């Protein structure tokens, strides 16, 4: 191979691998913040569906 | 041949042969026998091969690397620029190595050529050798087997802090 070909191929490899490394560090930080705060789409552990609640007039009024 | 200024040679001064004896030296007879039996046939074969070279002449080139930005003006952890800076630095390191090799060849050729008065007659080559070895040692010594442009920049910054503190405490 030419030194041009190997050199610029190496630079393509370095760009791909550095972008993957920055995204892995961001993935760690995103998982840390989402487990800490719970306001993202991940770690959304379920609560009770409020579509199950009966809203009719009941037998006794104080409810 | 080569470039006679990067590999300098002083003018050869050989004495005229002034024989005092009456006996013939065998060296002139052997010189004529070497000229006839050896030097002329080797010359003819080389002229034959050189004609064959001149029948088809083609050229090779010295590769020229243009300078890229060095490690100082590369951002931290920016591999696309500091890679180029590192390749630049490694080529400069290999070339500085061969500069030291050139000056060592000069010193050894001076010592043999001057012979017995080599200690006086090779002071300029010794001085150039001491300067280029001091430069190479300040530039590249003790970096390690995992040397880089960052290691050399850190060594240079430590040396410059030492020089700045030594200058400032002397004023």
Kindly describe this structure.
This is part of a larger assembly, with chains A (63 residues) and B (171 residues). Chain A is 56% helix and 0% strand. The longest helix of chain A has 35 residues, at 3-37. Chain A has 63 residues and is mainly alpha-helical. Chain B contains 5 helices and no strands. Chain B has helices spanning 26-54, 79-114, 118-121, 123-140, 149-168. Chain B is flat, with a radius of gyration of 26 Å. The interface between A and B is small, with 7 and 6 residues.
Provide a compact summary of the structure.
Chain A is 56% helix and 0% strand.
Chain-wise SSE layout:
The structure is cut from a larger assembly and holds chains A (63 residues) and B (171 residues).
Chain A: H1 3-37
Chain B: H1 26-54, H2 79-114, H3 118-121, H4 123-140, H5 149-168
Supply the key terms.
part of a larger assembly, 2 chains, A: 63 residues, mainly alpha, 1 helix, 0% strand, rod-shaped, B: 171 residues, flat, electron transport
Quick one: how many beta strands of chain B? Answer: 0
Helix-strand makeup class of chain B: mainly alpha
Shape of chain B: flat
Q: What is the helix content of chain A?
A: 55-70%
Return the string of H and E elements of chain A.
H
- The computed structural class of chain A is mainly alpha
First-residue to last-residue Cα separation of chain A: 82 Å
What's the shape of chain A? rod-shaped
User: What's the Cα radius of gyration of chain A?
Assistant: 27 Å
Oligomer: part of a larger assembly
Strand content of chain B: under 5%
Count of helix runs of chain A: 1
Query: Termini distance of chain B?
Result: 54 Å
Largest sheet of chain B: none
Q: Tell me about the biggest sheet of chain A? A: none
How many whole angstroms does the radius of gyration of chain B measure?
A: 26 Å
Which two chains share the most extensive interface? A-B, 7 and 6 residues
Portion of residues in helices of chain B?
55-70%
């Amino acid at each position: 191979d030419a030194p041009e070909k190997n050199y610029e191929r190496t630079m393509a490899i370095l760009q791909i691998e550095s972008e993957k490394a920055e995204l892995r560090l961001k993935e760690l930080e995103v998982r840390r913040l989402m487990r800490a705060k719970g306001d993202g789409p991940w770690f959304q552990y379920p609560t009770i569906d409020k579509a199950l609640i009966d809203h009719s007039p009941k037998a006794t009024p104080d409810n | 041949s080569w470039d006679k200024d990067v590999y300098p040679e002083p003018p050869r001064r050989t004495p005229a042969p002034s024989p005092q004896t009456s006996l013939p030296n065998p060296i002139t007879y052997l010189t004529k026998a070497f000229d006839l039996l050896v030097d002329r046939p080797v010359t003819l074969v080389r002229e034959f091969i050189e004609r064959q070279h001149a029948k088809n002449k083609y050229y090779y080139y010295h590769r020229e690397f243009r300078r890229v930005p060095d490690i100082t003006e590369c951002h931290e952890k920016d591999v696309l620029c500091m890679f180029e800076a590192e390749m630049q630095w490694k080529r400069d390191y290999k070339v500085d190595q061969e500069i030291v090799n050139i000056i060592q060849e000069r010193l050894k050729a001076c010592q043999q050529r001057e012979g017995e008065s080599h200690r006086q007659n090779c002071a300029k080559e010794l001085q150039q050798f001491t300067q280029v070895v001091k430069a190479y040692q300040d530039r590249y010594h003790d970096l390690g087997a995992h040397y880089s442009a960052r290691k050399c920049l850190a060594k240079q910054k430590q040396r410059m802090l030492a020089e700045r503190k030594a200058t400032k405490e002397a004023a």
